[PDB]
Amino acid sequence: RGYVYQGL
Amino acid sequence: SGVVQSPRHIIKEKGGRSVLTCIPISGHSNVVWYQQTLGKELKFLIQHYEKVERDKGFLPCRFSVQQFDDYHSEMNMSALELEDSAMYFCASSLRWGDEQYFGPGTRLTVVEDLRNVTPPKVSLREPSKAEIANKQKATLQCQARGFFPDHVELSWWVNGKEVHSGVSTDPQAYKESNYSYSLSSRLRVSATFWHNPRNHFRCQVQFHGLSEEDKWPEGSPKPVTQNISAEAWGRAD
Amino acid sequence: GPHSLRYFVTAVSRPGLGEPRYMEVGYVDDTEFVRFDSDAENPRYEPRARWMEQEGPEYWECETQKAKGNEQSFRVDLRTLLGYYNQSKGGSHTIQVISGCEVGSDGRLLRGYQQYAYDGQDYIALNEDLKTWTAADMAALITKHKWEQAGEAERLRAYLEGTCVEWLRRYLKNGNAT
C-alpha cells in the first residue's frame, strides 16, 4: 500500500 | 504526572466485550496503542494524531479505537477470543516522531468459563533446621497454588514493611492443570534474623479476580479482586 | 515461487531552481505497477499495469493523501540533514529509501528491509531482527536515537510483517486474475 514516513 | 491507563486487570469471558481507556500526558496530541502478548515481541496496533488516524498496523477489525476532544483514547474490544489475552500499552508522544511515554499497561486475560476463576491458596513453610545449621542462611518458601488466571503479584512483608532484598520469585507462573495455576517464591534470610522470635514474616499474594459488573453464578463466593497472605513468626531453636 | 513487493522513494533537492521533486515508485516482484511524481500539472498516484487499474477509486485518493504527506516530511528532512552535516544552504541533495517485504511461495515472510540513503551513500537501515537499527555515521547515530525514543522500529516492523504481506497477497491476486 505504502509506508507513512515520518520525520527522521 | 505520567500517562494513566485503566482498568489494569480485567477478566472477560470468551465472546464478551470490554473497553480500554488511556489518559495521555496533558497537551500530548499523538497517542498510540501497543499490544504485547504473554509471549514476546511488541505488536504495533494503531496510532492516532490529533483525533484522527495516522497509521494502522495489527489492529483487527474487531477492535475499534478513537481519540476524543480531551485527546484521551479508548480501545473498544468486541467479540473477544483467547488469542486476545495479552497486555496492552499506551504511549503518548507530544508530536509524531517525538519521545513517547508509555502508560502502566493493562492486563487482559480471556477465560473460557467465568466459573473457573478462583482465588489462590497461599501457605508459608519455615526453613529446614538442617539449612540454618549448615548454610546459616534460612530460606522461606512460599507456595501459592490453585488460582486462575494468573493476575498474581506476590510480595514479601517483614515487620509490616515490604522488602525486596534477597527474595527470589518465579518469573512465570507454572500451570499445574488446565484451569489452575501455581506460583512459588523463596526468601533467603540469615540464621540470626530468622531465629529472633520478634520478627514477623508474611508472604502476601495479590489476586485480581472478577469485577463487580460480571454476574456471579450463585452457590459460591464471588472471586473478587483480593490479596491473601500467609504469615509466620520467627522461632528460636 | 517467492514473490516480493518493494517501493523506491526519491527526494532530489534543487536549491533556488525550484522545490525538491519527490517521487514514489512501486514494484511488485520486479514489475513497476504504480508511481507518484511531484513534477506534474496535477500530481497523483497512477497505475502502471492493467491489473492495477482494477483497484478502486478510494485507493488512489487514500494513497495520494499519504504520498503528499510523505513529501512534506522529506522536504523537512532535506533541511534537517543539512544541520547535521553542516552543508551549504544552497546545494543539491538526494535521499533514497527502499522499502519492501519478500515472501516465499508459502505466503510466509522471508525477509523485510528498509534502507535510507543519502547522496548515493548509505545512511541507516532496519536490521534482520526488525527491532534494531544500524547507523552509518555520526548523523545517523543521532537519527537512530530519535527513532528508538519514538518507537519507530515497531511501526515499521508492523508494516513489514502485516500491511506489506497482506497487500502483496491482494496485489498478486489482481495480477494473476488479469
CSV table of C-alpha atoms in Angstrom, one decimal:
chain,number,residue,atom,x,y,z
A,1,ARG,CA,0.0,0.0,0.0
A,2,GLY,CA,2.7,2.4,1.0
A,3,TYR,CA,4.6,3.5,4.2
A,4,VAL,CA,3.6,6.6,6.1
A,5,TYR,CA,7.1,8.0,6.5
A,6,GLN,CA,7.6,10.4,9.5
A,7,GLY,CA,10.4,12.7,10.4
A,8,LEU,CA,14.0,11.5,10.9
B,1,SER,CA,2.5,13.3,36.3
B,2,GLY,CA,2.6,10.3,33.9
B,3,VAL,CA,0.1,8.9,31.5
B,4,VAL,CA,-2.8,6.9,33.0
B,5,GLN,CA,-4.2,3.6,31.8
B,6,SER,CA,-7.3,1.9,33.3
B,7,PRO,CA,-8.5,-0.6,34.0
B,8,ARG,CA,-5.3,-2.6,34.5
B,9,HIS,CA,-6.8,-6.0,35.3
B,10,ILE,CA,-9.9,-7.4,33.7
B,11,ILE,CA,-11.3,-11.0,33.4
B,12,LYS,CA,-13.6,-11.3,30.4
B,13,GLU,CA,-15.4,-14.4,29.3
B,14,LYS,CA,-15.0,-15.6,25.8
B,15,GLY,CA,-17.3,-13.8,23.4
B,16,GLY,CA,-17.5,-10.7,25.6
B,17,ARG,CA,-16.7,-7.0,25.1
B,18,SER,CA,-14.6,-4.5,27.0
B,19,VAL,CA,-13.2,-1.0,26.6
B,20,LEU,CA,-9.7,0.1,27.5
B,21,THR,CA,-9.1,3.8,28.3
B,22,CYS,CA,-5.9,5.8,28.1
B,23,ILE,CA,-5.4,9.3,29.5
B,24,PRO,CA,-2.3,10.7,27.8
B,25,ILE,CA,0.0,13.4,29.0
B,26,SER,CA,-1.6,16.9,29.0
B,27,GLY,CA,-1.0,18.6,25.7
B,28,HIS,CA,0.2,15.5,24.0
B,29,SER,CA,-1.5,15.1,20.7
B,30,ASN,CA,-0.1,11.8,19.3
B,31,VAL,CA,-1.4,8.6,21.0
B,32,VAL,CA,-0.5,5.1,20.0
B,33,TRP,CA,-1.8,1.7,21.3
B,34,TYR,CA,0.6,-1.3,21.6
B,35,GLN,CA,-0.3,-4.9,22.1
B,36,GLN,CA,2.2,-7.1,23.8
B,37,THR,CA,1.3,-10.8,24.3
B,38,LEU,CA,2.2,-13.0,27.2
B,39,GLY,CA,4.8,-14.5,24.9
B,40,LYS,CA,7.2,-11.8,23.5
B,41,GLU,CA,7.9,-9.1,20.9
B,42,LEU,CA,5.9,-5.9,20.6
B,43,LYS,CA,3.0,-5.5,18.2
B,44,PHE,CA,2.1,-2.1,16.8
B,45,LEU,CA,-1.7,-1.7,16.8
B,46,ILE,CA,-2.7,1.8,15.7
B,47,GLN,CA,-1.6,5.4,16.3
B,48,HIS,CA,-3.8,8.5,16.4
B,49,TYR,CA,-2.6,12.0,16.0
B,50,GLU,CA,-4.9,15.0,16.9
B,51,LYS,CA,-8.2,13.0,16.9
B,52,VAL,CA,-7.5,11.2,13.6
B,53,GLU,CA,-5.8,8.0,12.3
B,54,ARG,CA,-2.2,8.1,11.0
B,55,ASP,CA,-1.0,4.5,10.6
B,56,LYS,CA,-2.7,1.2,11.1
B,57,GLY,CA,-0.7,-1.9,11.9
B,58,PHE,CA,-2.0,-5.1,13.5
B,59,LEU,CA,-5.3,-3.8,14.9
B,60,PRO,CA,-8.0,-6.3,14.0
B,61,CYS,CA,-11.4,-5.2,12.6
B,62,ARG,CA,-12.9,-6.5,15.9
B,63,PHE,CA,-11.2,-3.7,17.8
B,64,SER,CA,-12.0,0.0,17.3
B,65,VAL,CA,-10.3,2.9,18.9
B,66,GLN,CA,-10.9,6.7,18.8
B,67,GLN,CA,-9.5,9.9,20.2
B,68,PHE,CA,-11.8,12.3,22.0
B,69,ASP,CA,-11.8,16.1,22.4
B,70,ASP,CA,-9.7,15.6,25.6
B,71,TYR,CA,-7.2,13.7,23.4
B,72,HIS,CA,-7.8,10.6,25.6
B,73,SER,CA,-8.1,7.4,23.6
B,74,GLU,CA,-10.4,4.4,24.2
B,75,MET,CA,-9.9,1.0,22.7
B,76,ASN,CA,-13.3,-0.8,22.2
B,77,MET,CA,-12.9,-4.6,22.1
B,78,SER,CA,-15.8,-6.6,20.6
B,79,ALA,CA,-16.2,-10.4,20.3
B,80,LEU,CA,-13.2,-11.3,22.5
B,81,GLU,CA,-11.2,-14.5,21.9
B,82,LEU,CA,-8.5,-16.3,23.9
B,83,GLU,CA,-5.8,-15.1,21.5
B,84,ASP,CA,-6.7,-11.6,22.6
B,85,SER,CA,-5.4,-12.4,26.1
B,86,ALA,CA,-2.4,-10.1,26.3
B,87,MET,CA,-1.2,-6.8,27.8
B,88,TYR,CA,-2.0,-3.5,26.2
B,89,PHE,CA,0.2,-0.4,26.4
B,90,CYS,CA,-0.5,3.2,25.5
B,91,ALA,CA,2.4,5.5,24.5
B,92,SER,CA,1.6,9.2,24.2
B,93,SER,CA,4.2,11.3,22.4
B,94,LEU,CA,3.8,15.1,22.2
B,95,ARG,CA,4.0,15.1,18.4
B,96,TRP,CA,4.7,12.4,15.8
B,97,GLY,CA,8.4,11.5,16.0
B,98,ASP,CA,8.9,13.0,19.4
B,99,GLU,CA,9.7,11.0,22.6
B,100,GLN,CA,6.8,8.7,23.6
B,101,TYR,CA,5.9,7.9,27.2
B,102,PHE,CA,4.3,4.5,27.9
B,103,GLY,CA,1.4,4.0,30.3
B,104,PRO,CA,1.3,1.4,33.0
B,105,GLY,CA,-0.2,-1.1,30.6
B,106,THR,CA,-3.4,-3.1,31.3
B,107,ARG,CA,-3.5,-6.9,31.6
B,108,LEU,CA,-6.4,-8.6,29.8
B,109,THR,CA,-7.0,-12.4,30.1
B,110,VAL,CA,-9.9,-14.0,28.3
B,111,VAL,CA,-11.3,-17.1,30.1
B,112,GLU,CA,-13.3,-19.9,28.5
B,113,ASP,CA,-15.6,-20.1,31.5
B,114,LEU,CA,-16.0,-17.5,34.2
B,115,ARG,CA,-16.8,-20.2,36.8
B,116,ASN,CA,-13.2,-21.5,36.6
B,117,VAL,CA,-11.9,-18.2,38.1
B,118,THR,CA,-10.8,-19.0,41.6
B,119,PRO,CA,-8.5,-17.2,44.1
B,120,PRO,CA,-5.2,-18.7,45.2
B,121,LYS,CA,-4.4,-20.8,48.2
B,122,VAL,CA,-1.2,-19.5,49.9
B,123,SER,CA,0.9,-21.2,52.6
B,124,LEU,CA,4.2,-20.5,54.3
B,125,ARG,CA,6.8,-23.2,55.0
B,126,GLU,CA,9.5,-22.5,57.5
B,127,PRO,CA,13.2,-23.2,56.6
B,128,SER,CA,14.6,-26.6,57.3
B,129,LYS,CA,16.6,-26.9,60.5
B,130,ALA,CA,19.4,-28.5,58.6
B,131,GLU,CA,19.6,-25.5,56.3
B,132,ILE,CA,20.1,-22.9,59.2
B,133,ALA,CA,22.5,-25.3,60.9
B,134,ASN,CA,24.7,-25.9,57.8
B,135,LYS,CA,24.3,-23.0,55.4
B,136,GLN,CA,23.4,-20.5,58.1
B,137,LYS,CA,21.1,-18.7,55.6
B,138,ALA,CA,17.4,-19.7,56.2
B,139,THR,CA,15.0,-19.8,53.3
B,140,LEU,CA,11.2,-19.2,53.5
B,141,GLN,CA,9.5,-20.9,50.6
B,142,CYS,CA,6.0,-19.5,49.8
B,143,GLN,CA,3.6,-21.7,47.7
B,144,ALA,CA,0.5,-20.1,46.2
B,145,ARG,CA,-1.5,-22.6,44.2
B,146,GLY,CA,-4.9,-23.2,42.8
B,147,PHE,CA,-5.6,-19.8,41.3
B,148,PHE,CA,-6.9,-18.8,37.8
B,149,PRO,CA,-6.0,-16.8,35.9
B,150,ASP,CA,-2.5,-15.6,36.9
B,151,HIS,CA,-3.3,-12.0,37.8
B,152,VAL,CA,-1.0,-12.5,40.7
B,153,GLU,CA,1.7,-10.3,42.2
B,154,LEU,CA,3.5,-11.9,45.2
B,155,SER,CA,5.3,-9.8,47.7
B,156,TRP,CA,7.3,-10.4,50.9
B,157,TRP,CA,6.5,-8.3,54.0
B,158,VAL,CA,8.7,-8.4,57.2
B,159,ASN,CA,7.8,-6.4,60.3
B,160,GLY,CA,5.0,-4.7,58.4
B,161,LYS,CA,7.5,-3.5,55.8
B,162,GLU,CA,7.7,-4.6,52.1
B,163,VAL,CA,11.2,-5.9,51.3
B,164,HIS,CA,13.0,-6.8,48.0
B,165,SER,CA,16.5,-7.7,49.1
B,166,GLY,CA,17.3,-11.4,49.0
B,167,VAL,CA,13.9,-12.6,47.7
B,168,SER,CA,13.6,-14.8,44.6
B,169,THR,CA,10.2,-15.2,42.9
B,170,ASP,CA,9.5,-17.4,39.9
B,171,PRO,CA,9.2,-15.2,36.8
B,172,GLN,CA,6.4,-17.1,35.1
B,173,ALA,CA,3.6,-18.9,37.0
B,174,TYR,CA,3.7,-22.7,36.5
B,175,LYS,CA,0.4,-24.1,35.2
B,176,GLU,CA,-0.5,-27.2,37.1
B,177,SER,CA,-3.8,-28.0,35.4
B,178,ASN,CA,-5.8,-26.6,32.5
B,179,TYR,CA,-7.7,-24.2,34.8
B,180,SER,CA,-5.5,-23.9,37.9
B,181,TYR,CA,-2.0,-22.4,38.2
B,182,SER,CA,0.6,-22.3,41.0
B,183,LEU,CA,3.4,-19.8,41.8
B,184,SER,CA,6.2,-20.1,44.3
B,185,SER,CA,8.8,-17.7,45.8
B,186,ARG,CA,11.5,-18.2,48.4
B,187,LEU,CA,13.1,-15.5,50.6
B,188,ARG,CA,16.5,-16.2,52.0
B,189,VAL,CA,17.3,-14.9,55.4
B,190,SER,CA,20.3,-15.2,57.8
B,191,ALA,CA,20.2,-17.5,60.7
B,192,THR,CA,20.5,-14.7,63.3
B,193,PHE,CA,17.5,-12.9,61.8
B,194,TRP,CA,15.2,-15.9,61.5
B,195,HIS,CA,15.9,-17.2,65.0
B,196,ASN,CA,14.8,-13.9,66.6
B,197,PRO,CA,11.2,-14.6,67.8
B,198,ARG,CA,10.3,-10.9,67.5
B,199,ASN,CA,10.5,-10.7,63.7
B,200,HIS,CA,7.2,-11.1,61.8
B,201,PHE,CA,7.3,-12.6,58.3
B,202,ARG,CA,4.4,-12.5,55.8
B,203,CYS,CA,4.0,-13.6,52.2
B,204,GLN,CA,1.0,-11.9,50.6
B,205,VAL,CA,-0.4,-12.8,47.2
B,206,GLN,CA,-2.4,-10.1,45.3
B,207,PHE,CA,-5.1,-11.6,43.0
B,208,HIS,CA,-7.1,-9.5,40.5
B,209,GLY,CA,-10.3,-11.5,40.1
B,210,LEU,CA,-13.7,-10.7,38.6
B,211,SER,CA,-15.2,-7.2,38.6
B,212,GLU,CA,-18.5,-6.1,40.1
B,213,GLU,CA,-20.1,-5.8,36.7
B,214,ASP,CA,-19.8,-9.5,35.9
B,215,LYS,CA,-22.7,-11.5,37.4
B,216,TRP,CA,-21.5,-14.4,39.6
B,217,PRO,CA,-23.4,-17.7,39.4
B,218,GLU,CA,-24.8,-18.2,42.9
B,219,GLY,CA,-24.0,-21.1,45.3
B,220,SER,CA,-20.4,-19.9,45.6
B,221,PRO,CA,-18.5,-16.8,46.9
B,222,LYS,CA,-17.5,-14.4,44.2
B,223,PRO,CA,-13.8,-14.5,43.3
B,224,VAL,CA,-13.4,-10.7,43.6
B,225,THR,CA,-10.0,-9.0,43.4
B,226,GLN,CA,-8.3,-9.7,46.8
B,227,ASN,CA,-4.9,-10.4,48.3
B,228,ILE,CA,-4.4,-13.3,50.7
B,229,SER,CA,-1.3,-13.7,52.9
B,230,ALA,CA,0.4,-16.4,54.8
B,231,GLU,CA,2.4,-15.2,57.9
B,232,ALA,CA,4.8,-16.9,60.3
B,233,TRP,CA,6.7,-15.6,63.3
B,234,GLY,CA,10.4,-16.2,63.9
B,235,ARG,CA,11.2,-19.2,66.0
B,236,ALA,CA,14.3,-19.6,68.2
B,237,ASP,CA,16.0,-23.0,68.4
C,1,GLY,CA,7.8,-19.2,-6.2
C,2,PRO,CA,8.9,-16.5,-3.8
C,3,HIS,CA,7.3,-13.1,-4.6
C,4,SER,CA,8.1,-9.6,-3.4
C,5,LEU,CA,6.7,-6.1,-3.2
C,6,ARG,CA,9.1,-3.1,-2.9
C,7,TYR,CA,8.9,0.7,-3.0
C,8,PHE,CA,11.5,3.2,-4.1
C,9,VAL,CA,11.4,6.8,-2.8
C,10,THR,CA,13.4,9.6,-4.3
C,11,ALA,CA,13.7,13.2,-2.9
C,12,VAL,CA,16.1,15.1,-5.1
C,13,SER,CA,16.8,18.6,-3.8
C,14,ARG,CA,17.3,21.6,-6.1
C,15,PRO,CA,18.0,25.0,-4.4
C,16,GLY,CA,16.6,28.1,-5.9
C,17,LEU,CA,15.8,26.3,-9.2
C,18,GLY,CA,12.6,25.0,-7.6
C,19,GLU,CA,11.2,22.7,-5.0
C,20,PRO,CA,12.6,19.2,-4.2
C,21,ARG,CA,10.9,16.9,-6.8
C,22,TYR,CA,9.7,13.9,-4.8
C,23,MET,CA,8.5,10.6,-6.3
C,24,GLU,CA,7.5,7.1,-5.2
C,25,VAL,CA,7.7,4.0,-7.4
C,26,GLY,CA,6.1,0.7,-6.5
C,27,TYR,CA,7.5,-2.7,-7.8
C,28,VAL,CA,5.6,-5.9,-7.3
C,29,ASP,CA,8.1,-8.7,-7.9
C,30,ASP,CA,10.2,-6.8,-10.4
C,31,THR,CA,7.5,-5.1,-12.5
C,32,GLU,CA,6.6,-1.5,-11.6
C,33,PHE,CA,2.9,-1.0,-11.1
C,34,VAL,CA,2.3,2.4,-9.5
C,35,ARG,CA,4.2,5.7,-9.5
C,36,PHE,CA,3.8,9.2,-7.9
C,37,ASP,CA,5.7,12.1,-9.5
C,38,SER,CA,5.8,15.5,-7.8
C,39,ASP,CA,6.6,17.4,-11.0
C,40,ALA,CA,3.3,17.2,-12.8
C,41,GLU,CA,0.4,19.6,-13.8
C,42,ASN,CA,-1.8,17.7,-11.3
C,43,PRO,CA,0.0,15.0,-9.3
C,44,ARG,CA,-1.5,11.8,-8.0
C,45,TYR,CA,-0.9,8.1,-7.9
C,46,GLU,CA,-1.1,6.4,-11.3
C,47,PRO,CA,-1.3,2.7,-12.2
C,48,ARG,CA,1.4,1.2,-14.4
C,49,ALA,CA,-0.3,-2.1,-15.2
C,50,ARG,CA,-3.7,-3.2,-16.5
C,51,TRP,CA,-4.2,-5.4,-13.4
C,52,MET,CA,-3.5,-2.4,-11.1
C,53,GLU,CA,-6.1,-0.3,-13.0
C,54,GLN,CA,-8.8,-2.6,-11.4
C,55,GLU,CA,-8.2,-1.2,-7.9
C,56,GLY,CA,-10.9,1.0,-6.5
C,57,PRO,CA,-11.1,4.8,-6.7
C,58,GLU,CA,-10.9,5.3,-2.9
C,59,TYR,CA,-7.5,3.6,-3.1
C,60,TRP,CA,-5.9,6.3,-5.3
C,61,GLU,CA,-7.2,9.1,-3.1
C,62,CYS,CA,-6.3,7.4,0.1
C,63,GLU,CA,-2.7,6.8,-1.1
C,64,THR,CA,-2.3,10.2,-2.7
C,65,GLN,CA,-3.1,11.9,0.7
C,66,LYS,CA,-0.4,9.6,2.2
C,67,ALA,CA,2.0,10.2,-0.6
C,68,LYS,CA,1.7,14.0,-0.3
C,69,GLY,CA,2.2,13.7,3.5
C,70,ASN,CA,5.5,11.8,2.9
C,71,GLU,CA,6.6,14.6,0.6
C,72,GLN,CA,6.1,17.2,3.3
C,73,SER,CA,8.2,15.3,5.9
C,74,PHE,CA,11.0,14.5,3.5
C,75,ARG,CA,11.1,18.2,2.4
C,76,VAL,CA,11.8,19.0,6.0
C,77,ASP,CA,14.3,16.2,6.3
C,78,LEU,CA,16.5,17.6,3.4
C,79,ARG,CA,16.7,20.7,5.6
C,80,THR,CA,17.2,18.6,8.7
C,81,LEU,CA,20.2,16.7,7.4
C,82,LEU,CA,21.9,19.9,6.4
C,83,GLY,CA,22.0,20.9,10.0
C,84,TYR,CA,23.6,17.5,10.9
C,85,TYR,CA,26.4,17.7,8.3
C,86,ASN,CA,26.8,21.5,8.1
C,87,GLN,CA,26.1,21.5,4.4
C,88,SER,CA,25.9,24.7,2.3
C,89,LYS,CA,22.5,26.3,2.4
C,90,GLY,CA,22.3,26.1,-1.4
C,91,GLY,CA,23.2,22.7,-2.7
C,92,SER,CA,21.6,19.8,-4.5
C,93,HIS,CA,20.9,16.7,-2.4
C,94,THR,CA,19.2,13.4,-2.7
C,95,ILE,CA,17.6,10.9,-0.3
C,96,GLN,CA,16.7,7.4,-1.5
C,97,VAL,CA,14.6,5.0,0.5
C,98,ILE,CA,13.8,1.4,-0.5
C,99,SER,CA,11.1,-0.4,1.5
C,100,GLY,CA,9.7,-3.9,0.8
C,101,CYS,CA,9.0,-7.4,2.0
C,102,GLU,CA,9.6,-10.6,0.1
C,103,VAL,CA,7.6,-13.7,0.9
C,104,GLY,CA,8.2,-17.3,-0.1
C,105,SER,CA,5.9,-19.4,-2.1
C,106,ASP,CA,4.3,-20.5,1.2
C,107,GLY,CA,3.0,-16.9,1.7
C,108,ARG,CA,5.1,-16.6,4.9
C,109,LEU,CA,7.5,-13.7,5.3
C,110,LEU,CA,11.1,-14.5,4.4
C,111,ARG,CA,12.7,-11.0,4.9
C,112,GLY,CA,11.8,-7.4,5.1
C,113,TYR,CA,14.0,-4.3,4.6
C,114,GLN,CA,14.1,-0.6,4.8
C,115,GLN,CA,17.3,1.3,3.7
C,116,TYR,CA,17.8,5.0,3.8
C,117,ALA,CA,20.5,6.5,1.6
C,118,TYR,CA,22.0,10.0,1.2
C,119,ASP,CA,23.8,11.3,-1.8
C,120,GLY,CA,24.4,7.8,-3.1
C,121,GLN,CA,25.9,6.6,0.2
C,122,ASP,CA,24.2,4.5,2.9
C,123,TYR,CA,22.8,6.2,6.0
C,124,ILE,CA,20.6,3.9,8.1
C,125,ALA,CA,18.7,0.6,7.7
C,126,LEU,CA,16.4,-1.7,9.6
C,127,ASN,CA,18.1,-4.9,10.8
C,128,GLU,CA,17.4,-8.5,10.1
C,129,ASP,CA,15.8,-8.8,13.6
C,130,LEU,CA,13.3,-6.0,12.7
C,131,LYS,CA,13.7,-4.3,16.1
C,132,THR,CA,17.1,-2.7,15.9
C,133,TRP,CA,18.9,-0.2,13.6
C,134,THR,CA,22.4,0.2,12.1
C,135,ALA,CA,23.5,3.8,11.7
C,136,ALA,CA,26.3,4.6,9.3
C,137,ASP,CA,27.8,7.9,10.5
C,138,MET,CA,27.5,10.3,13.4
C,139,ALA,CA,24.5,12.0,11.9
C,140,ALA,CA,22.6,8.7,11.7
C,141,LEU,CA,23.6,7.9,15.3
C,142,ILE,CA,21.5,11.0,16.1
C,143,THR,CA,18.6,9.8,14.0
C,144,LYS,CA,18.8,6.3,15.5
C,145,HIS,CA,18.2,7.7,19.0
C,146,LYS,CA,15.2,9.7,17.8
C,147,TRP,CA,13.5,6.6,16.4
C,148,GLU,CA,14.2,4.5,19.5
C,149,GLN,CA,12.7,7.1,21.7
C,150,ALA,CA,9.7,7.4,19.3
C,151,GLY,CA,9.1,3.7,19.0
C,152,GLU,CA,9.6,4.0,15.2
C,153,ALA,CA,11.0,0.5,15.0
C,154,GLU,CA,7.6,-1.1,15.9
C,155,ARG,CA,5.6,0.9,13.4
C,156,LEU,CA,8.0,-0.1,10.6
C,157,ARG,CA,8.1,-3.7,11.9
C,158,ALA,CA,4.3,-4.0,11.9
C,159,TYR,CA,4.1,-2.5,8.4
C,160,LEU,CA,6.6,-5.1,7.1
C,161,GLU,CA,5.1,-8.1,8.9
C,162,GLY,CA,1.4,-7.2,8.4
C,163,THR,CA,0.5,-4.5,6.0
C,164,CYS,CA,3.1,-5.3,3.4
C,165,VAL,CA,2.4,-9.0,3.2
C,166,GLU,CA,-1.5,-8.6,3.3
C,167,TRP,CA,-1.2,-6.0,0.5
C,168,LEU,CA,1.2,-8.2,-1.5
C,169,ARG,CA,-1.4,-11.0,-1.4
C,170,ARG,CA,-4.1,-8.6,-2.7
C,171,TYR,CA,-1.9,-7.2,-5.3
C,172,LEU,CA,-0.8,-10.7,-6.6
C,173,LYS,CA,-4.5,-11.7,-6.7
C,174,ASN,CA,-5.3,-8.9,-9.2
C,175,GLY,CA,-2.2,-9.6,-11.3
C,176,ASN,CA,-2.9,-13.4,-11.6
C,177,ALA,CA,-6.6,-12.7,-12.3
C,178,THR,CA,-5.7,-10.3,-15.1
